[PDB]
Amino acid sequence: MNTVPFTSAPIEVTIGIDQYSFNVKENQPFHGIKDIPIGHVHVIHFQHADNSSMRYGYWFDCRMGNFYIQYDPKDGLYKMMEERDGAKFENIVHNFKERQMMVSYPKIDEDDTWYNLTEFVQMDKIRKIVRKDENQFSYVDSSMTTVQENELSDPAHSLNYTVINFKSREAIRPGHEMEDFLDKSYYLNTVMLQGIFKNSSNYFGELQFAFLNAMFFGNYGSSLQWHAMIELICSSATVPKHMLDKLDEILYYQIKTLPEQYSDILLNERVWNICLYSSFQKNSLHNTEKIMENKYPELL
Amino acid sequence: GAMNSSNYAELFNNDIKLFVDDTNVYRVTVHKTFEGNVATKAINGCIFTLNPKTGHLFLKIIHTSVWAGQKRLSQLAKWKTAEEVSALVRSLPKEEQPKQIIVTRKAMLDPLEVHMLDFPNIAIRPTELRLPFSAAMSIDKLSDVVMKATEPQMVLFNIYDDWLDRISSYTAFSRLTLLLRALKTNEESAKMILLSDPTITIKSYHLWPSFTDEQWITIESQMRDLILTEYGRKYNV
C-alpha cells in the first residue's frame, strides 16, 4: 500500500483519487492519501472551489517513485512532484500518518471498478500520449487539445492520441474504396492492431485512458478519441472473439461509472445507436446494451 | 458549403465545377414472376455529370452488366457513380480538373469523398437546390444512346446546343432547368410544346430545336405556364 503526501492545502479544492473524491477547506490540515493500491495506474485530480473551470490532475504509478503534492502560489495550482531522497520521503509519510492527517484510499474489497476501468492502461503508454519525459507522472486538464484536433496549436501540451480518421488514405485501400469504408476490418486489424498498436491490449489501454480523461476532466478530444475507437471496432465485420467479449466488459464499467448527469455531452448519440443497433457487432455487446437501455434509454 | 439560392451565381464564375446527378444510374422495371412474386429487371442507366458554365455534359452510360451478381444495388450504384466520376477527373488534364463537385443528392457525399481522397483540393459539395436533372432521360437523344448501349460507354454532349453563342451561362442554365423541370412535371405536354411545329428542327449535332430568340421566349413562357398549372392540380390551389 503506497502513499502520496501533500505538503499543505492552501486553497479550497475538491480533490479526487481515481473515482473517489473529498472536499478540502482552505488551509485545512490535509496531508495526503494513503493505502493507495499498488499494481494499477492512478489519477489524483483537482477542482478549486473558486474555478469550477479547469479540472486538472496527474496520472501516476507508485512503483515508479515517491510522489507528493505541493501547492504553487505562483502558478496557482496543486503540482505533483517526485522526492528522490527515499529516506527523507518515508520520514514525511510516517510522521503524517502518526499525526493521522491522511485520508485512506477508500476501496471496498468487493469492488473491482478501478481495475476494470484501468485493466489495459500502462504508465509507459500514458507517457507517450502525454509527452513530458522529465517527469514520471502525467498532467492532463479540461482544455488540453489532441493532435488530431490541432490539425484542423502548442504541441508541448498535446494529447498525442493515435489519429483515427475514417475518410483517409490510411483507412481506405485504393481499389477497395467501398469495401473498406463499409467494413473497416482492414483498418482495425491490419493498419491499427498489427501496424500501430501491435496488440489489442495497447488499443484497449488507449481507449480506456481516453475515456477516463473525458470523465475526469471533461476533456472533449478525449471523448472524441474514445468514441472513434469504439466505432472502429463495431464497424468491422471481422473482430477476434476475445476482443469483442473484453470490449463488452470494458464499456460496461465505463457506462456504469459515468455520472448520470453527464450523459448528454460524454455519450455520442450517433456512435452508440450505430454500435449497439446498426453495426456488425450489434449483437456482441449484450452487457453494454443492457446497461445502456436501463440507464439512458432517452439517448437511444 | 452547400449550394443554395444565395450563392447561385457562383456556378457561372471561372472556377471549373461539375454537377453530378446519380438519379438514373440504377434503373429498374418492376414486374410479377410466374409464382406471383415481384422481381426487378435492370435497364441501362447514366451518370449525368454537367459543367453548368460551359454546357459540357459527360454522359457515362451504366450498362446492366455492371449489376450482375451484385447485392444491395442501390447502395452499390452510389459507389459506382463515385468510381466513375473519380475516373473522369483522373482522365482529365490537370488544368481541366474541377475545383468543386456538387452532388445533387447528399447520399453521394461519402462515396465521392472516399473516391476522391487522391484529390484533397477538390471540394465535394451538397446542394439545397431541387435540380430537375432526373428528367435528362426525357431528352430523346440522351435516352436513345443510353438504351442502345451494349457496353459501358462515355458519350459527350453540349447540353446547351449553341445557346452560349447568344446568351450567358446564367441564362443558359435557367433555360435548361426550366425545360427539364417542365419535362419532369408533365413529360407529354412538355414534349408536345417543343415539337408541335414541324418546321423547327433539331440539328443532328444538337439536343434541342433550333428556335430563334423570339421562339425561345414563347417556349419558355409555354413551359412556365405548364409548371404552374400542374402545381394547382397537384395541390388543389
From Swiss-Prot, chain A:
InterPro entries (UniProt xref): AAR2, AAR2_C, AAR2_C_sf, Aar2_N, AAR2_N_sf
Report if keyword Phosphoprotein is assigned.
Answer: yes
Q: Under the cellular component aspect of Gene Ontology, which terms does the record hold? A: cytoplasm; U5 snRNP
Q: Name one GO biological process term.
A: spliceosomal snRNP assembly
Identify the Pfam families for this entry.
Answer: AAR2 (PF05282), AAR2_1st (PF20981)
Which Gene3D superfamilies does the entry link to?
2.60.34.20, Aar2, C-terminal domain-like
| Residues where Phosphothreonine is found | 257
Give the main localization category: cytoplasm
**Modified after translation how?**
Phosphorylated on serine and tyrosine residues.
Keywords from the named record: Cytoplasm, mRNA processing, mRNA splicing, Nucleus, Phosphoprotein
Phosphoprotein as a keyword?
Answer: yes
Note down the stretches annotated as region Leucine-zipper: 244-265
Where it sits in the cell: the answer is: Cytoplasm; Nucleus
Where does the record place the modification Phosphoserine? 236
Q: How does it assemble?
A: Heterodimer. Interacts with PRP8 (via RNase H homology domain and MPN domain), competing with BRR2 for the same binding site. Component of a U5 snRNP complex that contains at least the U5 snRNA, PRP8, SNU114, AAR2, SMB1, SMD1, SMD2, SMD3, SME1, SMX2 and SMX3, but is not a component of the U4/U6-U5 tri-snRNP complex.
Q: State the remark under miscellaneous.
A: Present with 7330 molecules/cell in log phase SD medium.
What functional role does this protein have? Component of the U5 snRNP complex that is required for spliceosome assembly and for pre-mRNA splicing. Involved in splicing pre-mRNA of the A1 cistron and other genes that are important for cell growth.
Family classification: Belongs to the AAR2 family.
Q: What is this protein called?
A: A1 cistron-splicing factor AAR2
* Organism, as annotated: Saccharomyces cerevisiae (strain ATCC 204508 / S288c) (Baker's yeast)
Swiss-Prot record, chain B:
Q: Where do the record's region annotations for RNase H homology domain lie?
A: 7-237
Q: What is the effect of changing residue 21 to A?
A: Alters protein folding. Severely impaired growth. Strongly reduced growth at 35 degrees Celsius
Where would you find this protein in the cell? Nucleus
Cysteine disulfide links: none
Query: Superkingdom of this entry's organism?
Result: Eukaryota
Upon changing residue 21 to N, the result is: Reduced growth at 30 degrees Celsius. Strongly reduced growth at 16 degrees Celsius
Subunit composition and interactions: Component of the U4/U6-U5 tri-snRNP complex composed of the U4, U6 and U5 snRNAs and at least PRP3, PRP4, PRP6, PRP8, PRP18, PRP31, PRP38, SNU13, SNU23, SNU66, SNU114, SPP381, SMB1, SMD1, SMD2, SMD3, SMX2, SMX3, LSM2, LSM3, LSM4, LSM5, LSM6, LSM7, LSM8, BRR2 and DIB1.
What protein is this chain from? Pre-mRNA-splicing factor 8
What is the native source organism of this protein? Saccharomyces cerevisiae (strain ATCC 204508 / S288c)
Task: Name the gene behind this protein.
Answer: PRP8
Q: Report which part of the complete sequence is shown.
A: 1836 to 2069 of 2413
